[PDB]
Design a protein around this ligand. Structure first.
Ligand SMILES: N[C@@H](CCC(=O)O)C(=O)O
Ligand SMILES: N[C@@H](CCC(=O)O)C(=O)O
Ligand SMILES: N[C@@H](CCC(=O)O)C(=O)O
Ligand SMILES: N[C@@H](CCC(=O)O)C(=O)O
Ligand SMILES: N[C@@H](CCC(=O)O)C(=O)O
Ligand SMILES: N[C@@H](CCC(=O)O)C(=O)O
Ligand SMILES: [Br-]
Ligand SMILES: [Br-]
Ligand SMILES: [Br-]
Ligand SMILES: [Br-]
Ligand SMILES: [Br-]
Ligand SMILES: [Br-]
Lengths: 80, 80
């Protein structure tokens, strides 16, 4: 039982990004992962966030991205 | 936009409790709160966790508790 700590680290890293907002999350104790629906100004900020999460030791996948107006929405799955 | 940081602090505090497991959570960016379905050995551990969360500066409510076998299930709502 450590997954909520993973969301802790992700919370620090994502908190370090002013341009990113977390619209949704899907915490699955069964699957052993947590999904974050996040929004950013562009895809490069999203890749910066995935890189920072991966460098902090977390297993992270970034996908399901699409631009909607002035922002881009994507899914960051933390956990392995 | 600071609610995910609230889940960060709650993640530290709850991580400091070996007897407590987080079975569910309900992250509501709209309502400005997050709900945690947690399990513990007894109600006193639950009140210890609510007290530690409240003392760390978080607004927390503990309720909807019921014993089911050897453990007790309850709802901790963080956010105000
Ligand atoms: C103000 C945004 C800075 C950043 O891109 O992190
Ligand atoms: C796993 C990332 C995605 O949602 O594509
Ligand atoms: C707006 C385009 C999309 O998100 O599919
Ligand atoms: C082993 C449990 C200690 C505690 O109650 O925190
Ligand atoms: C608010 C706490 C509860 O679920 O009763
Ligand atoms: C088992 C009793 C209950 O949770 O209501
Ligand atoms: Br946010
Ligand atoms: Br871009
Ligand atoms: Br991980
Ligand atoms: Br846990
Ligand atoms: Br008790
Ligand atoms: Br709060």
């Amino acid at each position: 039982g450590q997954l909520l700590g993973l969301l802790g680290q992700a919370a620090t890293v994502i908190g370090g990004e002013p341009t990113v907002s977390v619209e949704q999350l899907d915490f699955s104790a069964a699957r052993g992962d947590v999904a974050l629906q996040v929004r950013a100004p562009g895809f490069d900020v999203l890749e910066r966030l995935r890189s920072r999460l991966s460098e902090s030791g977390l297993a992270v996948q970034l996908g399901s991205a699409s631009r909607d107006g002035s922002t881009v929405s994507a899914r960051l799955v933390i956990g392995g």
